[PDB]
Write a protein that binds this ligand. Sequence first.
Ligand SMILES: Nc1nc2c(ncn2[C@@H]2O[C@H](COP(=O)(O)OP(=O)(O)OP(=O)(O)O)[C@@H](O)[C@H]2O)c(=O)[nH]1
Ligand SMILES: Nc1nc2c(ncn2[C@@H]2O[C@H](COP(=O)(O)OP(=O)(O)OP(=O)(O)O)[C@@H](O)[C@H]2O)c(=O)[nH]1
Ligand SMILES: Nc1nc2c(ncn2[C@@H]2O[C@H](COP(=O)(O)OP(=O)(O)OP(O)(O)=S)[C@@H](O)[C@H]2O)c(=O)[nH]1
Ligand SMILES: Nc1nc2c(ncn2[C@@H]2O[C@H](COP(=O)(O)OP(=O)(O)OP(O)(O)=S)[C@@H](O)[C@H]2O)c(=O)[nH]1
Ligand SMILES: [Mg+2]
Ligand SMILES: [Mg+2]
Lengths: 429, 429, 430, 430
Amino acid sequence: MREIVHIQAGQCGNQIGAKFWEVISDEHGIDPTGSYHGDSDLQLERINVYYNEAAGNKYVPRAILVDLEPGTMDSVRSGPFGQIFRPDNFVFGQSGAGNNWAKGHYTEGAELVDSVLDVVRKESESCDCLQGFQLTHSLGGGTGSGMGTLLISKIREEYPDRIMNTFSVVPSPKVSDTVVEPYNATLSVHQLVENTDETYCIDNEALYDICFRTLKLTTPTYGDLNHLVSATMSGVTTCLRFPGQLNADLRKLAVNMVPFPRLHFFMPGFAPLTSRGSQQYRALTVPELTQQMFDAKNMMAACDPRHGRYLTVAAVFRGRMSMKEVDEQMLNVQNKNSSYFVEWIPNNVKTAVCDIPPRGLKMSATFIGNSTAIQELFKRISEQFTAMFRRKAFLHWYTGEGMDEMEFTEAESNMNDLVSEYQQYQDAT
Amino acid sequence: MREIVHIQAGQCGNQIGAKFWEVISDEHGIDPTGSYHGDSDLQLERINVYYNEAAGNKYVPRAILVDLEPGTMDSVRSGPFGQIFRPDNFVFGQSGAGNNWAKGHYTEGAELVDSVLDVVRKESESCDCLQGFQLTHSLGGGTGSGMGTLLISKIREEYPDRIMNTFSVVPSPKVSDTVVEPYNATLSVHQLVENTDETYCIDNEALYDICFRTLKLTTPTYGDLNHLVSATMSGVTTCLRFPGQLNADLRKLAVNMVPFPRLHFFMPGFAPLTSRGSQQYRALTVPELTQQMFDAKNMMAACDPRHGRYLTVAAVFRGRMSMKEVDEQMLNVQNKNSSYFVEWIPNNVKTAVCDIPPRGLKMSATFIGNSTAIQELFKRISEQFTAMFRRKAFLHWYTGEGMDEMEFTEAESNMNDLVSEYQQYQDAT
Amino acid sequence: MRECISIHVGQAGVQIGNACWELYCLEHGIQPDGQMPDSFNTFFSETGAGKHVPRAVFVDLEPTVIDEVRTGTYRQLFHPEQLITGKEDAANNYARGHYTIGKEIIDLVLDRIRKLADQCTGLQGFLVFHSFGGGTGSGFTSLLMERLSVDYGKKSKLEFSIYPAPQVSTAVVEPYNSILTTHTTLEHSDCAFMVDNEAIYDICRRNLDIERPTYTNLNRLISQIVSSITASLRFDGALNVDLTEFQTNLVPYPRIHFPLATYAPVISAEKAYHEQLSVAEITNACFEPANQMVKCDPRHGKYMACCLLYRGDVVPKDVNAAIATIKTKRSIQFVDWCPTGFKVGINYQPPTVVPGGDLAKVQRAVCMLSNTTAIAEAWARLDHKFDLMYAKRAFVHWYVGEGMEEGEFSEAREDMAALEKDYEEVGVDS
Amino acid sequence: MRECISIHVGQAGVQIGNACWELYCLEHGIQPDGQMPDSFNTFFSETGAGKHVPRAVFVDLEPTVIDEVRTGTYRQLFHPEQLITGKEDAANNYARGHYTIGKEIIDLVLDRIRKLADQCTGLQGFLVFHSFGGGTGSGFTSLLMERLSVDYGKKSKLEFSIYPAPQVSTAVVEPYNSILTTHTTLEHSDCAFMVDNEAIYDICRRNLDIERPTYTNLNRLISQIVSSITASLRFDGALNVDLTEFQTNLVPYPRIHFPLATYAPVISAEKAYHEQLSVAEITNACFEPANQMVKCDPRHGKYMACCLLYRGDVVPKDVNAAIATIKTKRSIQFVDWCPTGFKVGINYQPPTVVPGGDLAKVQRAVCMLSNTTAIAEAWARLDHKFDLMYAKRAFVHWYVGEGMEEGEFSEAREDMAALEKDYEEVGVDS
Ligand SMILES: Nc1nc2c(ncn2[C@@H]2O[C@H](COP(=O)(O)OP(=O)(O)OP(=O)(O)O)[C@@H](O)[C@H]2O)c(=O)[nH]1
Ligand SMILES: Nc1nc2c(ncn2[C@@H]2O[C@H](COP(=O)(O)OP(=O)(O)OP(=O)(O)O)[C@@H](O)[C@H]2O)c(=O)[nH]1
Ligand SMILES: Nc1nc2c(ncn2[C@@H]2O[C@H](COP(=O)(O)OP(=O)(O)OP(O)(O)=S)[C@@H](O)[C@H]2O)c(=O)[nH]1
Ligand SMILES: Nc1nc2c(ncn2[C@@H]2O[C@H](COP(=O)(O)OP(=O)(O)OP(O)(O)=S)[C@@H](O)[C@H]2O)c(=O)[nH]1
Ligand SMILES: [Mg+2]
Ligand SMILES: [Mg+2]
């Protein structure tokens, strides 16, 4: 009953993915071997959403791990929880893509993709009623971006009526992690606009800010960053996996959040978030949570929601709390912050409530904002793309792999059109 | 009640045969001396199918071991279980055939054949109700191929109303094990088409692939390969030897699988097959087994079933399982893979179920596919034959033994006709 | 799995190789006899029981330098067939290296490479160590590269090069050798890492307080840089960079494939105790011109790509912060066609220190590979040097005597002129 | 049961025999006195109580070489009647070997063979060791073969031959001897394994690091090859090959019965420690022209049959893999009439090593028997040599003086011309 298929591409994709898996196992009372050692029957009731049941009271993630290089895979295998994964679900190459989108999409990735697809199909067939697919990856590299997009394209072709959702780690504004990342992002976005139903935009710049400023982590590590992402991810599917009072799911959320097909790029957020010492000096009531959710400093995308308008916002609450209170809070935010919400979508806040809170907390919240401010990010990428492409810088690395200028051009154009569309709705009255 | 007579020819034939015997003894609770040390009365009920009862609570294989060279025989005798065999049932020459079909069929083999035949007749007379004969051998050498075919011919002449089944190890496509193997195979096939009722095609290339890819055996040995073959073999007779819910036998299987007399060349398969570590991470339910059975990577013949169509498929299941489930699975495979099944044989899947599973497993499956793709194999052999015969290469080795070109020619022609026939049914609507 | 084949050509290449393989052994816990009481495997193949052999070829046209290896401490480390020697050297003559002497052993060298490559399951590529100035380093290397390009195709090839100094030469004919080998190798090399002996000496004197640094010291320093480049492949890291990634991220146009290496921190133990070496601090050190290993001025050029490879106790956020501040800095200008100029690698393993070495043990290190229009200056200098001698046909008769044609000189020179113009064109803003 | 009779003719044949029987004894644990403190039995008959005697005949027309055997370490190993000597040698004259001197002992030799054969229950055939160049190796051997063909018929006969080198001769009349004996033996031999002293010396120098290899070394090497050929008969194996199988699988036409032997690995202990010797690795070694034991170029010819005999720690799948990759390789081309070119044997017993030998102890070995159109070159050379001397009738008077007729020379030459044409015809594609 509503199986989700999990797919992980590249170093980023696999590191976030592992963390996510760790989070989920703890929640469902699963140990590093796949055995259930939980307390309550509710933990196992909907375990089939993420786990296949193997022989001898074991549970195995419906997870496929993909990379053109093996090192990351090896690391995962050696990690805590590495042994829970199905050995045949690790699909790795030997070559790599050399941070090149073309290599991931057309060359090395192409050589590996069929093997992935075979596994994927099998996984799909395992499931009684497949909800769809969640892909974790970056847009800035070669495998996650080129191979990942290719995978998406094929999956969509095979299963056009299932939901495709992505958790994409997007390039940062202040500093680039690679030189060609604008190319890789731009190309990837071209595919994503046509082939995903919803995309959570996650940015490391925002994450670091959150960790340093809000969590009071002097020197945050990538693991810590991943943890936040995992928390968000778990939050989005919580209403599918546990009983609630007003239950959401992936389809419903998409319907509420996506008024036009191309505008499916969300700014995710998570609340609460406190230091170790600071948590004793405040109570986690619903209004506090709401307040934490609605501000720029708590968004995991490097763009200010106050630079645009919210088209829609979905809030997913976990824990025992009063529905009336929640509703009041939702009303209040709309009323007081009227200028940040588009006027032609009345009651543009959607609420879901799941009775099971995450571990360690009595209540939590997950925020999904569809804000016209995300256009800024796209614009930056377009600018950076242009600056390089106009001088044909690095182009021979991509053309050498069989790619043509036309493809680049079209991709750019598509991106530009999306930006224009975003602008149009931002400005509409 | 339904005695089977077992015959082994040449090195291959004897190595596979020994393994088979070992498998069978374990199943029926027989130790290396011929004494029953099993637990249940069901193990002895139908022991007469493969064993003669000797004096003093001993059981002896109804097995005849034949070779033109003695070394293999000696090895067998010295092996674990070597002492279980009747000493008078080892019939060996001193000369060999020098990898020459002619020597096996007309010369050295001819000198030895009468001695074999005498034993065979005696064995037949021992039995209350002889089902027929199973021959294990290769087609690529001289003894298994030439002598074996000769033996078959004589046996058929003597006992035309009994079933003749063969487990033939066929030449590989990528690499040849001998230079003249196309000649030896082609000649052998000429005999097999006219004189066997059913032939299981087993190919070492496929076997290695299975062992390396599926079983995760880094460096498989011939013993391991033989084990797989033995498992298949035991599977085909399981319903004759143990009580079941829907019982098959050799005759029934032949009837179901052979719609036209010449088309009796099967691609055998066995399921399940897993690594040592990987078995804990999956349950052996019937659908899983079915899935394992129906794919190209699990076939023991080096040809892709997706390159042709299935005329018929027989599936034999062992263990306690639900008949309904089995039926559903059978239906499902037919429905979803419609294009790989000939349209003019409705319900072309035959099912048998035996309640006794093999040792170590709770359930297993054996697959017998009659696929038009096997024509590829024959075509390859024909091509290779032609390439050599057109230049009369190596021909003096065969003509020197009294053979004429006409015989070769006729053999070639027969092979070609078979291929044509296969093609015709593949293409028919 | 991800094997790397190292080729050491001529005296420079061999001696540097000595330092590199010494370091690798210490890093992986391999003894000088090949024994150890899984990461090693990209650099060492494994044989029988308790022995590990470098994935390397050492080649020189004379026996003397390699004979030291054969008779030395690491005699048991290498298999005899991977230590290749001729009888007579190339005598600082590219012609002898490329043609007369080199054509006698090229087949042999390549045969051994083929044998090495046959035992690789996931060959990443080749690391070639040599100099621009020697007859072997120039002529043989060019020959070798040509053959490799033919027989292996698009497999990644990387060069570490002892580029000639502005005012510190050994040979008189260095400019000729440099020019010809650059010309001949250009279309066959994917990325070449220049390093200059003068600069390293300065570093040794200024930063390490060494009155009289020896070639050994320089070699040791080089070994560190090489280790940083390959540590991402030999060890587990937070954020990883492989040999294929450099050429994508550091080479914007095919001909402009000369990034420069800078390593930090280079300090003595006595000086290390009074300093806390943060990521920001070492990055700043790197991005200051005095710590560069080529005697050139980036303040007078523009950056086209910077790749920063951090190792040890390093935290991604910190690196980001460090880079951000360097971005602001006046002395760092980037070309106008490149808004994203940084590629960043972070590896968990701290730099290993060779017993009896000149460097102190640090918690963090960083190796920058940067590509700068300032390199044009060096090329201009070299061209000028060539021009002065060639105008008089000084030494030319030697080259012709070894089978080179005079027209090829002019050809080399014009190609280099073109290269110089290419840099200039790249320099200007859109 | 499956007995094999060995015949050693002339100095070469006898000396090689010494090396072979020494090896066999070590392999079966037979002491030099015939004692041991069941596999032996194909090569050794057994007498009374605690003594084993070689199924062998050693023949030479002079006493000196066999006298060494009689007085030497293995004096007690052989029965006196199996060591046969005349008084005067054939003096590098085929005529003396075949007629004048040979006709005096041929009856004796054959009588002893008959006695040997009478104690065989399952005679597989004969292994004949000799040279092409000597008067005994050429003339006597031809005589012997003729008689054997008559008295034993279709029993398999195999030859191991010291084929003359291209530029390393002992005698001047070698070409004459070679040509005549090839002519006379052709229709009587089923398969003959050529081996060349020059090639073996090269192998010894290059692969074993021996400055000055002796005939002893060559003999030892040969003994290995022979052991590989017969190990499938002397030991238990996974997949087996017998003496009758070779001629079926290696001889495509009656006259084209000259396959060549290649053995791998041939290494010293010092060199063996830095190498892991896989099936793929040794197969590749074999299939490279420098390790061949005839000085000829397969790259310039085509393969008609390859038979690969593996021994020791060898796994069938691995062998298959190895062969598959070699099939792809550009340097291996097969004739168009032969899509299946490989016969493969695999035996469990590792190669045994002679105490004080030049070869290191290995877990695996392989012996390839391959038949190549490249052998035509050798024949052409030999014919040319014959022509040069015969045009002047140089040395001819000797042969005529010993009862040969001049017409027989021309006959031999024309037959060889025909042979050469046959190879050529075979060469071309359909
Ligand atoms: N860094 C460093 N540079 C070296 C070393 N040895 C030589 N060089 C430099 O290399 C150049 C001389 O080249 P060599 O490698 O000795 O010459 P070669 O390659 O053997 O060429 P020929 O002897 O001419 O055949 C000069 O610029 C030297 O300063 C060394 O150990 N370390
Ligand atoms: N490999 C090898 N070749 C040998 C050996 N002894 C001699 N030869 C070669 O055999 C040829 C000479 O023939 P021999 O066998 O000495 O002569 P022969 O057969 O005794 O004939 P005559 O003395 O003429 O009666 C030359 O090509 C030698 O190089 C040996 O021990 N090993
Ligand atoms: N949040 C988070 N971001 C990461 C992680 N690893 C990498 N990134 C970010 O992702 C981008 C590069 O991701 P990476 O994993 O190298 O992609 P890749 O496609 O696997 O790289 P490649 O195989 O083409 S070379 C960089 O912007 C980096 O900052 C991680 O573990 N967590
Ligand atoms: N699966 C399997 N295949 C084998 C075995 N032994 C041989 N073969 C295969 O059989 C073929 C040759 O079989 P072999 O046993 O030599 O036939 P033979 O007739 O006895 O050979 P001969 O006496 O004429 S020389 C080869 O293709 C080889 O790969 C075995 O034990 N198991
Ligand atoms: Mg030098
Ligand atoms: Mg002599």
